[PDB]
Each structure stands twice: as structure tokens, then as C-alpha cells.
Amino acid sequence: TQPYDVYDQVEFDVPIGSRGDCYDRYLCRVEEMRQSIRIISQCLNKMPPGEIK
Amino acid sequence: XXXXXXXXXXXXXXXXXXXXXXXXXXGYSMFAVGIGALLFGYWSMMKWNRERRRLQIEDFEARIALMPL
């Protein structure tokens, strides 16, 4: 919804459960971890060579 | 020429995939081994118990045979 520094261009996956229990609140964090490398890999492929500051 | 950090693609690591898969046991197959081990278990155990009967009567026979005791 609210981009910071080059967002929406990178494909993000948001895990959302069904019940508000501790098990589903644990599963979403593990599913965040499996769907985190996708952002890292897209950041590796898309790099403009230029300025740091 | 200015050199900076370079990009690498190749395979892109392959992100988000289920590595978990069922192995060895399926369901119906393990129950055939389970009850199969039970059927082999009781049959082999009771043969020794019948072999114990050969000793059981013969051991108590010693008291009957010995009356000067």
C-alpha cells in the first residue's frame, strides 16, 4: 500500500492465516521466510550502477 | 572504466517451493507389516511356552520322585 524506496516493482507475498491462534501466527512467519528469497533474488537481478550517497 | 558490484542471474536460486515429501510409509503398506509382525510375534512366542511345558512337568517330577527328602 505505502511504498518506501522502490516498492510495488518488487513482487511481495504476504502470508495471512484463518484463526488467531499461536500456530497460525507461527506459520505466517515461516511462510514469510520461504517468501523472502524472492525479494532478495529480484534485488540481485535489478541493480543500477551509480551513486551511493 | 569504473567497476562496481555486478549482477548474477543464472537460476535465481528458486524461491518458495515445498521440499517436504512423504517417504517410505504410505498408509496401507505399514499396517500389513504391523499386524504381520504381531502374527509372527504371538506364533513364535507360544512355541517356546509349549517347549516350557516339557520342562515344567519334568522339574516338578523331581519332588514326586524324591520321598527320602
In the numeric block, which cell numbers belong to residue B22? 512423504
- The experimental method, as deposited, was cryo-EM
In the numeric block, which cell numbers belong to residue B24? 517410505
**Cα–Cα distance for residue pair B51/B47, rounded to 1 Å:** 6
Is residue B10 within 8 A of residue A32, CB to CB? The reply is no
Interface mutation vs chain A, best among B1, B5, B15, B18, most A CBs within 10 Å: B15
Question: How does A15-42 read in b/e, with b if 16+ C-beta sit within 10 Å?
Answer: eeeeeeeeeeeeeeeebeeebeebeebe
In residues, how long is chain A?
Answer: 53
Q: Cβ separation of B8 and A34 shorter than 8 Å?
A: no
Provide the resolution (angstroms): 4.3
In A4-23, the residues whose Cβ lies within 8 Å of chain B are 13
**DSSP secondary structure string, A6-48?**
S-SSS-------SS-STTHHHHHHHHHHHTSHHHHHHHHH---
Is residue A51 within 8 A of residue B6, CB to CB? The reply is no
**Cα–Cα distance for residue pair B16/A32, rounded to 1 Å:** 10
Amino acid identity at B18: X
Is residue A24 within 8 A of residue A17, CB to CB? The reply is yes
SS (H, E, C) B5-35: CCCCCCCCCCCCCCCCCCCCCCCHHHHHHHH
